Structure formats: C-alpha cells, structure tokens
C-alpha cells in the first residue's frame, strides 16, 4: 500500500496522487501541506463517491479537489497562489466509508513554490582541509528549494551534517559536512552528490586533497 | 472550521523525564483526536488515535487523555529518539491539525568540533571566495562564531545555519560561511574562525 505523488514545482503569483495496495473507491481522500514553518494543515477533502468536497477558509475558492476512481488517482488543482508555498501530501484515512477518519497512509510529498524569482541551478564546491577528518561541500546560489546532498551515493551516513539552507535573496546556499576516520580519505574516494530537481541538475564532486 | 490550540509550541526536558502537551478545541470533538510525530525527512507517524488508543508498535510511554474540549498527550521516561515535532489532529468533523510542539532533550555541555576550509579553486577562478567553518556536535545550541582576517575582526558577509537537535546525540551542529570576493580574498593571508575561552581554527594562504 503506497501513495505516489506527482509534482509540483515553481510558479509565479495541478498535483496528482497515484494509489495502490488498497481499494481506493472505498476510502475518502485528503490533501495536507507542510508549510516552511513546522506547521501541518488540512487543505482539501473528497469523499468515496467524489460528490463531497470540503476546503478550509484559508484556501477555499482557489483549490479544487477531485478524483478518478477508475484510475485510482486523486488530483488537486491550485489557483491564485501566494504563501501557498509548501510540501503537499495526499493522505488516506484509516478506515473505509464517508465518516472522517484520522490519516494512516501518507504520500512522499511534492513541493510547490510560489515566488517572483526564477529557477537557478546551484554551483557545487568541494571543501577539502588545507584520528578523523571532516570534509564538506558547499551548495551555492540555487532556487528554489529543495536540494538533496548525499555522500558516496548514500553509503556514508553516520557523521554527516547537512545544514538548513539560508536565503540571501534571492538565492539559497547550503553546506554539508561528513566526518570519516583518518586515512580512509584520501585513500578511499569521497564524493558528495547534489540534486536540484526544479532545474534537473545533478552534480557529483569528488573531494580532492590540497 | 474547528480550531485546535496546541501548547506549548516548544519543550525542553531532561532524559528520563516526562512531558505533557495539550490541545483545546473550539467545540466538543467527542474524543476524535489523534497525535502524530514528525521527524525531519520522514512522513508523519501516527502515535495515538481516539484520544488514548495507542498504535501497535508504540511504546507504553506514550499516552493520551481528555474529552469534550480538553485533551492531553504525554511522553514519559524521555529518550533521545523522542526528539521530534508533535501534532494533534481532530477528525470529529473534517480535519484540523494543532500548531505543533517541538521537543528538545537537555544534556551535558559539549564543546564543538571545529574545522575551517579555504575557498575551492573552482570558486576562485569564477571570482568568489567563500570560507567555511563547521562547529559540530556541541551543546547547548547558543554559540558564537567570530571571523578574523589578518588578525582583525571581519563582520560583513557571514551566513550562519544551525541544525536541529540530533536524535541520537542531543547535540547541535552549526555552519558559518564568510563570503568575500576573490579580489579581497587574495589581498590577505590568515583566516580564522573562533567559536565562543574560545576554540580557534585557522589557515594561511601559505
């Protein structure tokens, strides 16, 4: 049982959710969003038969929830966006029927950015130093959020610190550090992997000494 | 639209202690309340439904209680893994999440591990010069970085970023970036970040 969502992206002032593993026609559906603040918010509700739809006041009129039971998919159409910038989840209630049930399955989430700025890929710079060693790489001048940083495709997982992006308008900068035993670097190869989906850019940068 | 008042928005507690969050609804919600835990990078995780019904797999240290308008959620024998954000959700009639409650766990003071990094060659040939300082695995979160170029304090061009509390360490990490042009970078030799008796790390453009 999974919910797979489809973007999503950047817009200056329609999402889909594909369901499998359960009987979609028997459950209601909802959209939830997570603000850049740590705040969770219910955004739309649809019933089993798509005849019921409800929205909160902070979004009513601009959003329209819909479903296609034939293809086990849910949709959300968003218009006149503003501080609607958030990550959007499709959530499924824990039980069948048109009664309201707490959510028990969540999609991975797709981000929606509403800004009067334009997509910029990051410039990715390696941080090599001039017991254990700390390395880093700097992800500079991109827009919008988010970016994914990993080390050795994800295999270095302990001792990794990825710092929250800071907007020195109108661009984000982020940095990431990894700590490894002495000699495993530079003997082995350490590469930071960065992905910026809103610009379809992906860099791998090896950390070279000196 | 039913309104949920979660409180407090943020909590600090000792290891092994107990903590308690309350949600207050704008009408009777008839025990149709749930509690979720959210960890950065993970989808929301359900802890309690129908006020006090624990989920399978949820430790008995989590508990809920309440009726009508007043509800409470508690975590006892606090563990480092319990560092997250917690939300209530009424589903009596439609849905309303509470405001959220970030939880931090106290611990013994820790000095940061500091490292300084010169600008990379790629950035230099493109006209820029960012010097990066990491202050890793320290406690508590209040710390200060001072940048010195050739022995003199430099204040313009610094951007700072803290991580959230570590779920296994209870420490914090912080990153400080000094950005100069490549032009002003090449006119000086010694670069220093001091973390506040301070901890100093430097390099010289040889």
Residue numbers in the entry:
A (entry chain H): 2 to 14, 19 to 87, 89 to 136, 143 to 222
B (entry chain L): 1 to 196, 202 to 211
List sentences from the manuscript.
N-methyl-D-aspartate receptors (NMDARs) belong to the family of ionotropic glutamate receptors (iGluRs) that are involved in the majority of fast excitatory neurotransmission. NMDARs form heterotetrameric ion channels composed of the obligatory GluN1 subunits and GluN2 (A-D) and/or GluN3 (A-B) subunits. All of the subunits contain an amino-terminal domain (ATD), a ligand-binding domain (LBD), a transmembrane domain (TMD), and a carboxyl-terminal domain (CTD), which interact with each other in defined manners to mediate functions including channel gating, allosteric modulation, and cellular signaling. More recently, a number of studies on intact tetrameric NMDARs showed that the subunits are arranged as a dimer of GluN1-GluN2 heterodimers and that domains and subunits move in discrete patterns to control channel gating and allosteric modulation.
